[PDB]
A and B are shown apart, each in its own frame.
Chain A
């Protein structure tokens, strides 16, 4: 039964207990951005 509507889904839906895992990669540590940062000494190109 759809919690939103309350009507049953057309066809039957498989379900059950499954084992899942939260992997290493976390958005919190992989997200980033900058405006004006440091620049390489040699060439004034932005650091990476």
Chain B
């Protein structure tokens, strides 16, 4: 976060843009209070039988 902040104020519009569109997702994980490691699942949820009759 604090790095991409300084990264975003870069004069070149390009780098600034990519930095924005990155810190976007980062901030999402911040405000949400969720860990990204969960995106890699260890336990696959099985759907109930009557749901898959």
Contacts and interface: CB of A to CB of B under 8 A. Distances in A.
A14 interface: no
Q: What bracket does the count of chain B residues touching chain A fall in?
A: under 10
By secondary structure, the B interface counts as helix
A41 interface: yes
Contacts of A42: 51, 53
Interface string A31-48: 000000000011000000
A41 B51 CA distance: 9
A39 to B, nearest CB: 13
Interface of B: 50-51, 53
Interface of A: 41-42
